[PDB]
Amino acid sequence: SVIKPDMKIKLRMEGAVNGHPFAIEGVGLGKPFEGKQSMDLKVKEGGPLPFAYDILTMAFNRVFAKYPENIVDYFKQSFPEGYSWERSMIYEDGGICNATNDITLDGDCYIYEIRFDGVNFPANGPVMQKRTVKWELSTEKLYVRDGVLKSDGNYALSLEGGGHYRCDFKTTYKAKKVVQLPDYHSVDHHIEIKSHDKDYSNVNLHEHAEAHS
């Protein structure tokens, strides 16, 4: 109804990591029915970022995931009004991140207002020492609890010179109107920084997602 196969994205993130503030904004586009998207992100404050960019990328919209006919699509159903999400991320070395996103739609452009806050990242850790390479394929598990859609995920960042750095994601999704709620299902994610400048001021980000059951 308000979804075309080609959709635009505009966003601003405000946040802090270990009490050091920053701000990034982004512009991009995707194909909601194909579950593909890409965007260019520029750091506007707090640059150059003194931490691994990788902790941000997942904050940078489940509308962009291919849903099969036999699984309820909570996200596409939530427009034109939109929906929002809250999320906690607990890394195995005690660094903890919180984020929220409020998603509105203007014509054919999704608009994000994002808050991000990380704390307790050790100075000698892979995050503050920028030793991360990429997120491995992520399997997100979705279920309903007290009339709200929620998700769990056990993700992992590959590290410079081998090994992995683990993080547990917990997300709550809230449509702004009442929408049909899905049954239990999975979403596979591929997320990738395809190109960036040396200090990550500019970053070109890609994601591809498919739901399964």
In units of Å, what resolution does this entry have?
2.3
| 189 annotated as ligand-binding | no
- Give the Cα-Cα-Cα angle 49, 123, 191 (nearest 5 degrees): 50
Dig out the tokens for 153 from the structure: 């995920």
| 185 annotated as ligand-binding | no
Q: Distance between CA atoms of 195 and 91, rounded to whole angstroms?
A: 25
With b for 16 or more beta-carbon neighbours within 10 A and e for fewer, the 136-173 pattern comes to eebebebeeeeeebebebebebeeeeeeebebebebeb
In the chain, what are the domains? Answer: 1-213 (2.40.155.10)
